[PDB]
């Protein structure tokens, strides 16, 4: 990644083994649970396109997902080339979609773009494409419809609400009415009596 | 976070994998036991609003709590906008509530506010809102009333006092009389004989 | 904590996750065995009062002890206010007891005091109060009187001496005669024959 | 490796124990699964030829593979000598193939070449030869032909596609038609009905 | 410890949690096996007397040994005072034995002595006293005489030689003849035939 | 070790606990498997003679090997004294063999030699002697002759070749004919038919 060293200027540093291991392990443990995406974004802070490709390529499993991600990246790269069409000796060339994705650009070129004044943030642009692709995978691999999250007869309301919003997160909605409808008979009666405008805190307190 | 490097000036550094992992693991192990809040505050030292959102978004479970936290944040952001209402080329704009919460502001804007002279400490303001929300969750998820913490017949006084003050911490009180009333017959008699003004040390010594 | 960076001046750095975790884990594993206190002192090297409070507040268990510690701190803070009684624009105010304990002072104020010329070492003063409180807790939670540490018939002298001085450490004495008196018949006879002025090394060699 | 320190210039730093351990452990855990190669490339970022040899030589197992790698390196070194044939006091000599591979060059010579203006990137050249050799080993140790990856009667389509693209990665192809042909009767019928130009996302959605 | 920072001058840094933990763990795992002493010396590189006391005081077990160590330190401190007998405003005082041991000196005084020109190396002097004491403990806790290390009938010569020199290390000798005498009948006959001046390598080869 | 800090000049840094632990653990896990030597070389990068002795002395087991290593070092030190025979106030003395091995030289003297212009690389010279000694130990502790590595009837050729080259590495040869001769009847027939000049890759492919 590009890091502001202990002095000032922005400079390339190798990806740390701790970062590499952290990413490999979170994918192994969590697969494509929604929270893996913010972890990816955090672990790839300041990443060049080369670094982003390193992180994606170190994943051993989930090759269906990684092929789907490649398709999303290729679509975004094509849309870049449509909107931003393009060798002077010693001068910086303009990046194409495949340069942003790191397949046809060098690390030196990537650093050159990212540290230019003004900066051409190829790492951040590529990361956006990757996260777009990862979100699609999270949605596809979401096991259950929100319609099928219903509170059990002996299920604590808190545990039901956890399942409900876990599912909504994976299905990726932009809500409280379905939460009441899918509650068990006893909780539903309590929640109906609260009326409109009740906060989640108030609902959870009422059913505790 | 914003860190004073080995030279002087305040500068942004990415969140370390050790910090990211530490936070995810403490939430996994301790849930919303009261001590998770000081840990959150410590792990988010110098955090920008983006960093705070990263930490909250990397939590996979407890999505009922995370939805309640969003509601608290939205309330605090609205109260900010009421008290602090608000584009000159190249100039710093004033942050709204949604900018403090990192949803409508960029990292560059956040760094700009936090390192201004005088500083507009958007990271610290947002952290206050988050901790307010987390405290509410700790209180809600507290399993037992202090009224129901009573010393067992064969329970060491020390173990009872530990349960008592653990519960008070979770229920969040701003005390010694209820500790005596909820003690077992043998300890209660000893503690009654000590009289008023006895310290906890003296009570624990007397019942040892 | 306040650290001398790789250049010179004293500057604040956040508490590291490794430090935070180390402290939480030692309290979990060792409780209030005497050796936890030097570990606390070492882990809190250069700590501000805010940092010291962070470390104490991250402890989840032992809330009887943490309440006793608060009482000791309040007593020391009151004695500070008696001996050191106390707003000029832009000037440093004098710290009260509650400022030394971090409850009524800001981090910026604490850094200001600690890096003043001459320095007002509020972190070190508070750490002294904390260690005074922790020593009281170690003594209270010491399970056994030194009078009840006696050598078993088949117990190696070395193992007995380990138990003896472990107990003395916890009970906190400022000695060799009781060690002989509490030894088993066979070792006692050997140790009596050595006479006065025998070193612990000589005693342990004689009973090996 | 050669690292840009916190100031500027490129300078040699020893390989960290974390890097050494990371590489040894990934080879132990993953053998020559395809994802080990990007991990190798990432862990050897900025490596001198000496550093690359260190990493390869710390591998205890897989000595058939390491002998095959030596053969590939010797072939690439010979092709270098054919294309780039070659002592002035105090001057930099031109590297031969065996100098690029670190067998006949010193660390000081390697640093001299890598930090020259313009740079003679012996570390990157050698790393290319190594990765060429490792790719050959990955292909050889690939257990299964893509022809033998067929969807089970009760196998989820997602799990089949994972096996399919895992195998293609190991066999190293530069595709969708064989994926349909090797699917089970029920999925094959669904996929045939989608027609030409269907994306992997669309295929996986259709068979979910 | 006192460390030469990334710039130059010698400066105090706190003991790292990794160092603290490393020392506690090696004492827990190895007790007073001889190799713990070089580990102690390595972990306490650049230590002030305060740091050395921290390391010793963090040990929870082995309080017989720690009391014996105190006695050795007191003897060495007394011998210092005999050989080096001893307040000008703002000037450096001469250290006594108790100052070298850190019991009557401050950290600031210790840093002052250690970074003086010429340096008064109180950390190194104290470390010598400690290692002298630790060596005595290693010798005392050595379980077996070298006279009782004899090769078993079916014991590989290599395993016997390992036991032999492990024991000699613990007993602390400043040799080959006893190794032959304590070997089993078959190995003894082979070793006798080699004659005088045989190296350990030659002996081990002959009995392999 | 001597490290080029983040600024420039070469300066001493203490051995890290991570390095110390890494070395102790690799010796515990791998004993004198051949790959331990490159690990030793990597972990001791920039080591002074004192640092090298620290690493060797922290090994608890294998004291037969450590005694053999001492003998090799003494032989190399004697050969140094024969080839390089040898106090001006404030001037650098010439190192003897025992100074290179760190037994009669101080750390300050070692740093002085290693950072001289031109440098007298006592750390690298000593490391060469140590590695010479370690290689002898690896060869001695190699359990099996290459003559006794023969392919089993049902043993995959790859697994046989791994055993074969693992053994050759330990026995330390400077080859393909014995690999064919020691193969099983079925593989031998296939390999004979390939003829002369076949690569290991081609042999392994033919027997797969």
Curated annotation (Swiss-Prot), chains A, B, C, D, E, F:
Modification after translation, per record: Phosphorylated possibly by host MAPK1; this phosphorylation is necessary for Pin1-mediated virion uncoating.
Intrachain disulfide bonds: none
Residues with PTM Phosphoserine: 16
Result of changing residue 59 to A: Loss of infectivity
Consequence of changing residue 57 to S: Reduces protein stability. Loss of binding to FG repeats of human NUP153. Loss of binding to CPSF6. Decreases virus ability to integrate in intrafenic regions compared to wild-type virus
Interaction with human PPIA/CYPA and NUP153: region residues: 57-91
Region Dimerization/Multimerization of capsid protein p24, residue ranges: 141-208
Consequence of substituting residue 57 to D: Reduces binding to human NUP153. Does not affect binding to CPSF6. Reduces infectivity to non-dividing cells. Retains infectivity to dividing cells
Effect of residue 37 to S: Loss of infectivity
Location in or out of the cell: Virion
Effect of substituting residue 38 to A: Retains infectivity
Effect annotated for changing residue 74 to D: Loss of binding to CPSF6. Does not affect binding to NUP153. Retains infectivity to non-dividing cells
Function: Forms the conical core that encapsulates the genomic RNA-nucleocapsid complex in the virion. Most core are conical, with only 7% tubular. The core is constituted by capsid protein hexamer subunits. The core is disassembled soon after virion entry. The capsid promotes immune invasion by cloaking viral DNA from CGAS detection. Host restriction factors such as TRIM5-alpha or TRIMCyp bind retroviral capsids and cause premature capsid disassembly, leading to blocks in reverse transcription. Capsid restriction by TRIM5 is one of the factors which restricts HIV-1 to the human species.
Assembly information from the UniProt record: Homodimer; the homodimer further multimerizes as homohexamers or homopentamers. Interacts with host NUP98. Interacts with host PPIA/CYPA; this interaction stabilizes the capsid. Interacts with host NUP153. Interacts with host PDZD8; this interaction stabilizes the capsid. Interacts with host TRIM5; this interaction destabilizes the capsid. Interacts with host CPSF6. Interacts with host NONO; the interaction is weak.
Name the UniProt record assigns to this protein: Capsid protein p24
UniProt organism field: Human immunodeficiency virus type 1 group M subtype B (isolate NY5) (HIV-1)
Residues of the full protein shown: 133 to 351 of 500
């Amino acid at each position: 990644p590009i890091v502001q060293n202990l002095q000032g200027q922005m400079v390339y540093q190798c990806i740390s083994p701790r970062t590499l291991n952290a990413w490999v392990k979170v994918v192994e443990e969590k697969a494509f649970s929604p929270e893996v995406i913010p972890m990816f974004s955090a672990l790839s802070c300041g990443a060049t396109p080369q670094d982003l490709n390193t992180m994606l390529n170190t994943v051993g499993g989930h090759q269906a997902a990684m092929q789907m991600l490649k398709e999303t990246i290729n679509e975004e790269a094509a849309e870049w080339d449509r909107l931003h069409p393009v060798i002077a000796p010693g001068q910086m060339r303009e990046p194409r979609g495949s340069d942003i994705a790191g397949t046809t650009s060098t690390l030196q070129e990537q650093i050159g773009w990212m540290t230019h004044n003004p900066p051409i943030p190829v790492g951040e642009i590529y990361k956006r494409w990757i996260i777009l692709g990862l979100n699609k995978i999270v949605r596809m691999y979401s096991p259950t419809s929100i319609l099928d999250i219903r509170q059990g007869p002996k299920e604590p309301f808190r545990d039901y609400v956890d399942r409900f919003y876990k599912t909504l997160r994976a299905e990726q909605a932009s809500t409280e009415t379905l939460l009441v409808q899918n509650a068990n008979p006893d909780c539903k009666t309590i929640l109906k009596a609260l009326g409109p405008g009740a906060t989640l805190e108030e609902m959870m307190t009422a059913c505790q």
